[PDB]
């Protein structure tokens, strides 16, 4: 959380899907219906710069895409991810037309 | 990833590295020809690296394929980051095996408290 | 946040 250390080896982290409450209360007026928070409010565990665009897989399903947050692993500042379950139709249509 | 652990080699087969000289973002293989990532990771030139573990050393399981098409969500908002999703079509199909596999799209949204697995080569500090 | 860094320069 303090510095710049980019690994050569793929890193892993298991985190839970946080409720809407914890997500919206962490970023007032900044969370839309296409975002979900996954992480720990106590900070210390989180995705960071470089992990962007990466996968958040839950129960064998891609539920999130590393998107944004305020810094990395700061307390009460969990990462926010694109809510993939709203984009299946878009993904399908796009793949079929290209 | 901060406060994480080193994934077992190739235990995340759907994980890809977007490269343009060097790794800049992650991605997920959901189809033999398509990778999904974030729109804010957009670059006009992108090489997709599959079957990666140690992005600094050829291990012999990698498949380096250039992006043929890059499609960012039309409603992507750079200010709010709403619709931060992007699709990448590979110029040639990725060969699926034990080290390179697709990840399923959600059959439904996840309930709160659902444990998930996050991966990547981003900043660890 | 949880953005890019490497190969973004
Ligand atoms: Ca390698």
């Amino acid at each position: 959380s303090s510095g710049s250390s980019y690994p050569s080896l793929l890193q892993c982290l298991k985190a839970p899907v946080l409720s809407d409450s914890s997500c919206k209360s962490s970023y007032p007026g900044q969370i839309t219906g296409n975002m979900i928070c996954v992480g720990f409010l106590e900070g210390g565990k989180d995705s960071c710069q470089g992990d962007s665009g990466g996968p958040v897989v839950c129960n064998g399903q891609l539920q999130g895409i590393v998107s944004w947050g305020y810094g990395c692993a700061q307390k009460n500042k969990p990462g926010v991810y694109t809510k993939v379950c709203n984009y299946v139709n878009w993904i399908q249509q796009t793949i079929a037309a290209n | 990833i901060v406060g994480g652990y080193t994934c077992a080699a190739n235990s995340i087969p759907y994980q890809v590295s977007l490269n343009s000289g060097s790794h800049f973002c992650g991605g997920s293989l959901i189809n033999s020809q398509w990778v999904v990532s974030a729109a804010h990771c957009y670059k006009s030139r992108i090489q997709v690296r599959l079957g990666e573990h140690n992005i600094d050393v050829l291990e012999g399981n990698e498949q380096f394929i250039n992006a043929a098409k890059i499609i960012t969500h039309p409603n992507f908002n750079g200010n709010t980051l709403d619709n931060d999703i992007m699709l990448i079509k590979l110029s040639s199909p990725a060969t699926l095996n034990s080290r390179v596999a697709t990840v399923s799209l959600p059959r439904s949204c996840a309930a709160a408290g659902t444990e998930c697995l996050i991966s990547g080569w981003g900043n660890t500090k | 946040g949880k953005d890019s860094c490497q190969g973004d320069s």
Side-chain angles (χ1 to χ4, degrees), chain B residues 52-55 57-59 62:
Chain B
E52 281 287 14
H53 180 54
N54 184 328
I55 56 171
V57 176
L58 291 172
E59 300 162 295
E62 311 81 358

Side-chain angles (χ1 to χ4, degrees), chain B residues 1-100:
Chain B
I1 305 291
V2 181
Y5 60 99
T6 300
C7 321
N10 307 109
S11 59
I12 313 299
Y14 50 77
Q15 175 77 56
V16 302
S17 169
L18 301 190
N19 184 298
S20 60
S22 60
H23 168 87
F24 63 96
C25 278
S28 195
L29 185 70
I30 70 291
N31 173 298
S32 67
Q33 302 199 72
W34 293 84
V35 161
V36 67
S37 180
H40 76 268
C41 282
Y42 180 76
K43 291 196 189 305
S44 57
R45 157 59 218 304
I46 303 177
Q47 181 184 69
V48 179
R49 301 195 165 188
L50 305 76
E52 281 287 14
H53 180 54
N54 184 328
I55 56 171
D56 295 311
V57 176
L58 291 172
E59 300 162 295
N61 300 146
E62 311 81 358
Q63 292 182 54
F64 297 170
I65 309 170
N66 289 156
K69 295 175 185 173
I70 300 172
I71 303 297
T72 59
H73 199 284
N75 297 160
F76 170 60
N77 187 316
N79 165 54
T80 58
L81 270 303
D82 190 39
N83 305 118
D84 194 15
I85 193 288
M86 165 180 87
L87 290 177
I88 301 292
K89 191 186 187 180
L90 307 186
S91 65
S92 69
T95 311
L96 312 182
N97 54 53
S98 63
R99 306 77 160 56
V100 186

Side-chain angles (χ1 to χ4, degrees), chain A residues 12 17 32 51 58 67 82 85 87, chain B residues 5 7 82-84 109 113 116 122:
Chain A
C12 272
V17 173
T32 69
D51 300 313
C58 330
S67 183
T82 308
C85 67
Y87 299 95
Chain B
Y5 60 99
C7 321
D82 190 39
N83 305 118
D84 194 15
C109 298
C116 308

